[PDB]
Design a protein around this ligand. Structure first.
Ligand SMILES: [Zn+2]
Ligand SMILES: [Zn+2]
Lengths: 48, 1858
């Protein structure tokens, strides 16, 4: 599937923090319709 | 009572006032005070009254309206016929047919080169259709009108009645005369009856009157049209249509209609023509990559203006733009581009233009200053970074600075700060008091300043001339005269006076003059300033161009054409690539009055920074203050000045002002460079903050931005469109930012006129379409016979402009055949005109025209082909088309003539060649030896040399006998010194025996005598001569030219010089010809031409029969790529190779000024640099050079103790990179050169025995490039066949046999320091003499290989790291890591030595990068510095060459190394491997180095043994010992010693510090640590290959005692695949199968990688195979891999690699690529059982072509074997390529008879798309099929390895898949 970093945030008593997920819809997202770096995934697999 | 003419072509501006005033005089009255009183105008007025007592006067038209009638008349008669044009073109074609055999030479050289000849015939182009038709009536009328106006202009520019009688004698039935008056009439059926009244012309039918300039305009345009259409006719190839000629006739007639019904006002329409063509070109570009978004509003702008000019001006503009849009091709549109001057030039309205200029300049603004502050802060940051880099020393003064500033510690420690610090001070660098950096010279050479620039007047003489005269235009004074009257320049004192105020109020005048041929009714205005002001501007701009511009790269002002092309190619990579990996936009910015709108408040702080760095203040600033405080006037009208004794008070200032007393602005042609600097800085700021990888190009007005963007190789449609959206977004953002900045500086940018594209670019009327430099031919063929200003119409000059125009066309183009044919045609045309009439000869020739049969043939051949050196003085040989800046034209000519001699059977050509062999030598006395000083590589000839020498000598005579009448004392004494010592010094120079002439020339020009000769060659203007000297010089020069042309025609009609047999080995002839000319043996000049020492016919690597038998035959290899496209849409992947080009022949891509010399003292120092090359130290010539430089200085000069090195192992025609060196000009456009690589490593065989051949390779490369490109484009089948040229002459090749010069004669010089100050006193800055230590000797050739390769490595590393630590340009040159040293060296010791050298280089970089906190962490600093050096070394290309020697590969891959996956092993992976080995050497094995006490001495070599590198090397070694001799943190004493070393390298490395400050402290600081631990050698590294380095060290090691390494495999799976005809289809199978997924788990479990990890998959199939095949054919794979596994399994197996090359531009310059690394990892036995590894690239790799498969069959036949296995592993997602692959593989297997097994890798998804055509297209020889799958395959992938098998002779015509 395409890549969709769904961004959101949270507030704890006082301050805030960020949060990201691959499977959510809170509608502020960064998406890309191409991986183009799977060779790097294979590289990391070979390493591990 | 005599004046010259000096006016033939239209160079002057154009104007209507003279005609108007003459009309007002003709009506009634006396002359109205503004008429340029002369005798000619008086007699003209007399005759004009005597014929204008008629009645037409009163309804007469004038200029600005006169043309109106004329153009109408012309189009009328142009479509009518006559009885005159027939005769003219009949005679012209008769001349051509009489000159037809000439072309035979051309055809013969092309047939010797191996190319076809166009059979139509260039030179008989006027006999196919040129008669009785519309196009031939328009051509003949055009030519006839040109002839008419030529005769008119000759009568006008004649002098005496005798010339006019001569003219009328020639033309009788055309002209008529009325004596008793000067009343000459010229009739014609078109133009009626003109009355050329000496200096005026009148037309009766077209009832008007006008002056000479209009006649020149019309003559020029008719000539342009004629010669353009002529060369357009009969071309070799269908580059153009024939509707180009028809459309161009239509276009010209449309322009005629426009002019005839819209007046001069219609000249805005061509101003719209040009951008219309540009828009059409762009809109024809985007069709190839139409998926990107084109920006801007250029086409909307064009459409709006066309509709405007259609509504106004009538429908004529509509017809014009319609006929313009009629064109469809691209080259036709460019041919329309070039003719924006083929219609005329407009009568300007100076008053209107000056009013607009006044308003545009006085328009005040409200601009910002903080932007300029940030901009100048950026500039100062850049200049200080550069200063620190080159000279490791800041340029501040903490005495004046604050303390709460991070730079007081970053200055107490001489470092550079990081990013966050510079961000903390990002806009405050002005608050730093930057001190002087670039010392200015106390004098300068006159060649850089003096020029015929028409120096203005000053206020005193202006007021006096106004009080005296009653009116008229100003004649301005001249520059050389003012210079000879006043004292010379002392720029230090001048600028100090300006720093003290200075430039008093009197010398602030400027005058305007209207520019020429600019096509604007308002008209441009170029200015002429006063003496002091012009001096200011000139020295300032030269100062910047020398020491500032090199920092910036956009700044294309002081650059030649080759460097322009290099820059364009660098900034266009990403245009027309066929993919989406390189998108480059191009924004052409053209401001609105950039010069005028540039104003004071902008350029204050930038100019202030420049002024601080030169040690001045407010000086540059004062510029606009001068424009505020200065008078400005117009030259062509003086009566309007009414000066009030305080200011101007101009008159008539209601119809439009003319003068004024001040202006806030600037003018064109002034301070282009500083204004370009500020604009460029703005652009760079905006881009760099938005996009960092932008490149810029700027001459000041026509700016170009180029942002590049990279997008991934494999991308999908959605992601691709997303990327392109972001791309357009960023580009639009940058354009908006530029406009914001420009409005922040007052520079308004036109939004609807800035041009944008992505597959187009323009620079200075040079169009670049998809990386291809597209040529306009029309400008250059239009300039035929349009000689330059202040020149004479000689045969030589017109033939020279023809030749150089054609050669610049070739440099802008390809396919040299076309410019050669045009050269022929235009030359014949020009000489036909010149022989029709010769002005300086004052009559017709009658010796050449009357000839017939053969003699006229010999005459033309001698006129055109013979060179100026070989008897003739007019022509040029075709050998100058190969290269332009060749070192010796003699060899070129002789080679050409030899080839034409032995390649023929006719008679007269033999006579011509024999003439060229013995060119009638003359005397051998003085007054001829001087020629060798002005132009060496020439011959003492009976008949004189080029007239430059004659002018120099005549002006020398006039200046010697009139030295007393030059006021200045210095120039007087210099000429006095000249007279005597010139003869005596020439005697001494002849007293030098070996006669190396280049040295003598440079010595003559480097002594004091270069001063007078310099200015004497700077005299080239007739009026300059007439002003300075008297009629004697002018008359003598005219008589000399008369005699010279007489002797010239006599030479061109000499006796045939009866033949004497052909000659061998031309260059030898040239040498002995020089010998018998000047007596003694000559050296240097004799350089061979590649046309002789490379053979004529090249041959492909296939079918050459050389192979490896007969011997180590040398060759020049040419690897062509399969991407070759003869069309203009691809640009190739590559860059090209053109070479260098020195800018000393007026080829700067403009013509404003030149760069002739620099200085005599610097030339003398260059000689001192070249003392030991061919002269011994203790000799007379060394004594002479020292005496010379001590004469041009004081006896208290700190001489440099000239060096103690010896480059005995080197050439002799590589003297200096000043005037001729670095041979190569790349006469052909580099566009096709993007498809080509050219290697010379084969020629390494020449150094089998050494002998110091050392011949230049660049001409070889270039000749091969040119003619192989021509031979490819004439046969498009061999798109991948690597060629190789063999040598033909061995006697050309010259062992240097190094030689020396010496004499017994000594000559004493006179003092020139107490006799000439202000010229020589302070030209060059200090030198900071260093004391030598005698550099204890080496004793080198007593060791073995393993004992010294360590030393060689350490030396190379040390030198490289030094040249990197100080930012020299020689950090990326191949002279450091040569290639004749890896083949014989111990690899382990070599690499460990490299490590040692890199380490001590890190020591010096540590000494530099030393802040106050890094001291307490020095070990990490050392490591990081080593890493920095290794990074720069990764950026070094040519290191990867060492991977050719298998020993080095074994030693470098013995350690674990990341293996690459590309066949064309690039810089990246190779250098990564080398650096991984080096990083493994360090950090594991550092103890082995710096120990083993007989490895510690540091042996330095003598490749760069100058004083600079020397002390730096000793410093590096000392600092390395001091970083060593330490394990814990440092101590303060160590820090003190290190700071002292830093100060010492600061002192030696230029700057503005004290010289050394001691000698005893120096020796005490360097002794016991470096001096007795270096062993210097007097030898270069290369020649070491002779003695011991050449002795190979046999590696007597075997192995490391490891087991048998038993081999392994894994599981598999079989699948069935049957076939039949019908092939029905289901839907669910496609639905579940044709969905490509991707999920890498098992592609990562494939641990091993060689190319992609495929042998894992191809083990089991072959383990199942049961033949043990002898012969595999692997194809499509990248590297090794599958092949390597094949060689593992079957030992008795061999291989045919069909791996694709796909070369990239990251490779080396010439050398050939290297084999795939995977196989070289295998071993010696596995490699030898490969067929041929060092000869793969010579073979093709184009799977889609047939020649590859013919090569396979050829291998099968040459080897006693037959194919058994085939493997195909080409991964492709496309369709057509794999279809072609399968077609040819099927025809191959059908062309095999024996048993066969084939393996095909495929993807199941394509196995159901019916457009695949794989099984139904391949299954035409194989009945047996089985599919195979592996246990290691991508986790979700339809990968199938299908295995076919057959036994022989099966067809199975076609079968689809069931
Ligand atoms: Zn030869
Ligand atoms: Zn060959």
């Amino acid at each position: 599937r395409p890549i969709t970093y769904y961004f959101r945030k949270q507030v704890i008593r006082g301050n805030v923090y960020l949060s990201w997920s691959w499977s959510n819809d809170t509608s502020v997202f960064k998406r890309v319709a191409c991986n183009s770096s799977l060779s790097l995934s294979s590289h990391w697999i070979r390493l591990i | 009572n005599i004046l010259r003419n000096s006016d033939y072509n239209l160079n002057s501006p154009l104007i209507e006032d003279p005609a108007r005033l003459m009309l007002e005089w003709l009506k009634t009255g006396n002359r109205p005070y503004r008429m340029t009183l002369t005798d000619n105008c008086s007699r003209s007025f007399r005759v004009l009254k005597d014929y204008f007592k008629k009645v037409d006067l009163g309804s007469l038209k004038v200029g600005g309206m006169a043309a109106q009638s004329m153009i109408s008349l012309w189009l009328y008669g142009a479509h009518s016929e006559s009885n005159r044009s027939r005769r003219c073109i009949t005679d012209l074609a008769h001349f051509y047919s009489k000159s037809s055999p000439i072309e035979k030479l051309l055809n013969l050289t092309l047939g010797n080169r191996g190319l076809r000849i166009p059979p139509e015939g260039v030179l008989s182009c006027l006999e196919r259709v040129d008669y009785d038709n519309a196009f031939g009536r328009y051509l003949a009328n055009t030519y006839s009108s040109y002839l008419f106006f030529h005769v008119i202009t000759l009568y006008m520019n004649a002098l005496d009645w005798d010339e006019e009688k001569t003219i009328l004698a020639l033309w009788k039935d055309l002209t008529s005369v009325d004596i008793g008056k000067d009343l000459v009439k010229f009739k014609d059926q078109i133009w009626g009856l003109l009355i050329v009244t000496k200096d005026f012309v009148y037309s009766q039918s077209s009832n008007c009157l006008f002056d000479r300039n209009y006649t020149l305009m019309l003559k020029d345009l008719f000539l342009s049209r004629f010669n353009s259409l002529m060369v357009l006719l009969s071309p070799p190839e269908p580059r153009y249509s024939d509707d180009l000629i028809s459309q161009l006739c239509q276009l010209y007639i449309a322009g005629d209609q426009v002019l005839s019904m819209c007046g001069n006002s219609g000249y805005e329409v061509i101003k719209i023509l040009e951008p219309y063509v540009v828009n059409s070109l762009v809109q024809r570009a985007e069709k190839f990559r139409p998926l990107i978004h084109s920006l801007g509003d250029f086409p909307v702008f064009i459409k709006d203006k066309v509709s405007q000019l259609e509504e106004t001006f009538g429908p004529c503009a509509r017809r014009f733009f319609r006929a313009l849009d009629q064109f469809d091709n691209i080259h036709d549109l460019v041919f329309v581009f070039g003719c924006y001057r083929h219609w005329g030039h407009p009568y300007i309205d100076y008053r209107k233009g000056l009013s607009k200029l006044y308003d545009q300049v006085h328009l005040k603004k409200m601009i910002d200053k903080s932007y300029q502050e940030c901009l100048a802060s950026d500039l100062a940051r850049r200049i200080l970074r550069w200063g620190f880099d080159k000279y490791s020393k800041w340029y501040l003064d903490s005495r004046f600075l604050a303390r709460d500033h991070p730079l007081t510690p970053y200055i107490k420690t001489q470092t550079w700060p990081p990013k966050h610090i510079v961000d903390l001070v990002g806009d405050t660098w002005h608050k730093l008091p930057i001190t002087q950096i670039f010392e200015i010279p106390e004098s300068m050479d006159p060649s850089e300043i003096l020029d015929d620039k028409s120096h203005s007047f000053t206020r005193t003489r202006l007021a006096s001339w106004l009080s005296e005269n009653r009116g008229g235009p100003v004649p301005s004074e001249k520059v050389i005269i003012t210079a000879l009257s006043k004292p010379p320049v002392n720029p230090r004192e001048f600028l100090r006076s300006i720093d003290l105020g200075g430039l008093p109020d009197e010398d602030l005048i400027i005058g305007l003059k209207p520019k020429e041929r600019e096509l604007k009714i308002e008209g441009r205005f170029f200015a002429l300033m006063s003496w002091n002001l012009r001096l200011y501007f000139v020295i300032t701009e030269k100062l910047l161009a020398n020491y500032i511009l090199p920092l910036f790269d956009a700044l294309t002002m002081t650059d030649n054409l080759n460097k322009v092309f290099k820059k364009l190619i660098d900034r266009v990579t990403g245009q027309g690539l066929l993919d989406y990996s390189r998108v480059t936009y191009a924004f052409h910015l053209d401001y609105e009055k950039w010069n005028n709108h540039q104003r004071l408040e902008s350029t204050e702080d930038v100019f202030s920074v420049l002024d601080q760095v030169f040690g001045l203040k407010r000086v540059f600033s004062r510029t606009h203050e001068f424009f505020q405080k200065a008078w400005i006037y117009y030259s062509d009208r003086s009566d309007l000045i009414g000066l009030r004794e305080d200011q101007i008070y101009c008159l008539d200032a209601s119809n439009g002002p003319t003068c004024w007393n001040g202006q806030d602005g600037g003018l064109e042609g002034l301070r282009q460079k500083g204004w370009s600097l500020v604009s460029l800085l703005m652009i760079d700021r905006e881009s760099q903050i938005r996009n960092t990888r932008t490149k810029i190009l700027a001459q000041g007005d026509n700016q170009v931005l180029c942002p590049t963007y990279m997008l991934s190789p494999g991308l999908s449609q959605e992601g691709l469109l997303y990327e392109l959206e972001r791309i357009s977004r960023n580009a639009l953002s940058i354009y908006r930012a530029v406009e914001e900045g420009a409005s922040k500086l007052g520079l308004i940018i036109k939004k609807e006129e800035t041009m944008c594209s992505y597959d187009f670019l323009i620079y200075g009327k040079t169009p670049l379409f998809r990386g291809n430099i597209l040529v306009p031919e029309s400008k250059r063929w239009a300039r035929v016979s349009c000689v330059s200003n202040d020149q004479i119409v000689n045969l030589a000059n017109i033939m020279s402009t023809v030749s150089t125009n054609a050669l610049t066309v070739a440099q802008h183009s390809q396919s040299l055949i076309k410019p050669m044919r045009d050269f022929l045609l235009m030359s014949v045309q020009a000489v036909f005109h010149y022989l029709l009439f010769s002005p300086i000869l004052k009559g017709r020739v009658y010796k050449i025209l009357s000839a017939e049969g053969e003699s006229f043939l010999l005459a033309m051949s001698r006129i055109i082909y013979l060179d100026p050196s070989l008897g003739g003085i007019s022509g040029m040989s075709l050998g100058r088309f190969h290269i332009r800046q060749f070192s010796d034209p003699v060899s070129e000519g002789l080679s050409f003539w030899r080839e034409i001699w032995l390649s023929s059977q006719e008679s007269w050509i033999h006579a011509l060649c024999q003439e060229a062999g013995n060119p009638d030598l003359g005397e051998r006395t003085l007054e001829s030896f001087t020629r060798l000083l002005e132009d060496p590589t020439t011959l003492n000839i009976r008949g004189g040399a080029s007239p430059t020498i004659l002018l120099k000598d005549a002006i020398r005579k006039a200046l010697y006998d009139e030295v007393d009448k030059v006021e200045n004392s210095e120039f007087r004494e210099a000429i006095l010194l000249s007279k005597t010592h010139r003869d005596n010094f020439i005697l001494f120079l002849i007293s030098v025996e070996p006669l190396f002439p280049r040295f003598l020339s440079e010595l003559f020009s480097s002594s004091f005598l270069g001063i007078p000769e310099s200015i004497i060659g700077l005299i080239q203007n007739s009026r300059t001569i007439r002003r300075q000297f008297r009629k004697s010089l002018s008359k003598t020069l005219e008589e000399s030219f008369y005699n010279s042309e007489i002797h010239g025609i006599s030479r061109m009609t000499q006796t045939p010089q009866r033949v004497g047999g052909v000659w061998p080995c031309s260059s030898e002839r040239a040498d002995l010809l020089r010998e018998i000319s000047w007596g003694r043996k000559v050296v240097g000049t004799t350089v061979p031409h590649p046309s002789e020492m490379l053979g004529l016919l090249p041959k492909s690597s296939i079918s050459c029969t050389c192979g490896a038998t007969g011997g180590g035959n040398p060759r020049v290899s040419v690897s062509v790529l399969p991407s070759f496209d003869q069309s203009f849409f691809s640009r190739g992947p590559l860059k090209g190779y053109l070479g260098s080009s020195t800018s000393m022949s007026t080829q700067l891509f403009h013509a404003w000024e030149k760069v002739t010399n620099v200085h005599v003292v610097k030339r003398a120092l260059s000689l001192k640099e070249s003392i030991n090359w061919f002269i011994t130290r203790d000799s007379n010539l060394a004594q002479a050079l020292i005496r010379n430089i001590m004469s041009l200085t004081g006896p208290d000069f700190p001489l440099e103790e000239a060096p103690v090195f010896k480059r005995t192992g080197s050439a002799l025609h590589r003297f200096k990179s000043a005037r001729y060196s670095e041979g190569g000009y790349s006469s052909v456009c580099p566009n096709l050169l993007s498809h080509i690589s050219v290697s010379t490593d084969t020629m390494s065989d020449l150094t089998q025995d050494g002998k110091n051949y050392d011949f230049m390779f660049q001409p070889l490369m270039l000749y091969a490039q040119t003619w192989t490109s021509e031979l490819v484009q004439r046969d498009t089948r061999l798109r991948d066949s690597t060629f190789h040229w063999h040598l033909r002459c061995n006697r050309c090749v010259r062992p240097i046999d190094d030689v020396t010069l010496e004499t017994s004669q000594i000559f004493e010089f006179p003092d020139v320091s107490k006799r000439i100050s202000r010229m020589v006193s302070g030209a060059v800055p200090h030198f900071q003499r260093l004391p030598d230590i005698r550099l204890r000797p080496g004793d080198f050739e007593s060791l073995s290989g393993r004992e010294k390769s360590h030393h060689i490595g350490s030396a190379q590393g040390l030198l490289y790291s030094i040249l990197v630590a100080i930012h020299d340009s020689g950090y990326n040159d191949g002279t450091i890591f040569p290639v004749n040293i890896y083949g014989k060296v111990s690899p382990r010791d070599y690499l460990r030595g490299l490590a040692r050298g890199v380490l001590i280089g890190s020591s010096i970089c540590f000494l530099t990068r030393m802040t106050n906190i890094n001291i307490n962490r020095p070990l990490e600093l050392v490591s990081g510095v080593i890493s920095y050096i290794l990074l720069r070394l990764d950026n070094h290309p040519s290191l990867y060459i060492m991977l050719r020697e298998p020993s080095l590969r074994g030693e470098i891959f013995s350690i674990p190394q990341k293996i690459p996956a590309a066949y064309p092993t690039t810089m990246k992976e190779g250098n990564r491997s080398i650096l991984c080995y080096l990083q493994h050497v360090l950090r594991y094995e550092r103890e082995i180095i710096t120990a083993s006490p007989e490895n510690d001495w540091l042996w330095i070599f003598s490749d760069f043994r100058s004083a600079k590198m020397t002390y730096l090397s000793l410093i590096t070694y000392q600092s390395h010992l001091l970083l060593q001799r330490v394990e814990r943190n440092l101590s303060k004493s160590m820090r003190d010693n290190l700071r002292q070393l830093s100060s010492l390298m600061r002192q030696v490395l230029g700057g503005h510090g004290e010289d050394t400050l001691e000698s005893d402290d120096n020796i005490q600081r360097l002794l016991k640590d470096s001096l007795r631990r270096t062993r210097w050698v007097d030898q270069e590294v290369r020649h070491a290959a002779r003695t011991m380095t050449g002795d190979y060290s046999p590696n007597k090691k075997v192995s490391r005692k490891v087991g048998c390494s038993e081999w392994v495999c894994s599981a598999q799976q079989v699948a069935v695949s049957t076939s039949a005809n019908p092939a029905p289809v289901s839907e669910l199978d496609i639905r579940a199968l044709s969905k490509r997924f991707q999920n890498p788990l098992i592609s990562g479990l494939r641990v091993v990688q060689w190319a992609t990890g495929a042998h894992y998959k191809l083990k089991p199939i072959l383990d199942d195979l049961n033949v043990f095949p002898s012969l595999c054919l692997v194809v499509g794979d990248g590297s090794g891999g599958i092949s390597r596994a094949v060689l593992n399994m079957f030992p008795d197996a061999k291989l045919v690699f069909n791996s694709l090359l796909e070369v990239n531009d990251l490779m080396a310059s010439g050398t050939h690529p290297l084999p795939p690394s995977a196989i070289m990892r295998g071993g010696n036995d596995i490699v030898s059982r490969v067929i041929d590894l060092d000869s793969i690239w010579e073979k093709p790799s184009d799977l889609r072509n047939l020649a590859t498969w013919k090569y396979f069959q050829s291998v099968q036949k040459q080897v006693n074997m037959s194919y058994d296995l085939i493997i195909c592993d080409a991964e492709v997602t496309d369709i057509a390529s794999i279809n072609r692959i399968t077609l040819l593989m099927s025809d191959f297997a059908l062309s095999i008879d024996g048993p066969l097994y084939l393996v095909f890798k495929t993807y199941g998804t394509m196995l159901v798309n019916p457009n695949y055509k794989a099984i139904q297209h391949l299954s035409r020889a194989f009945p047996s099929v089985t599919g195979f799958i592996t246990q290691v395959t991508s986790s979700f992938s339809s990968e199938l390895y299908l295995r076919f098998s057959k036994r022989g002779k099966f067809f199975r015509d076609a079968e689809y898949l069931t």
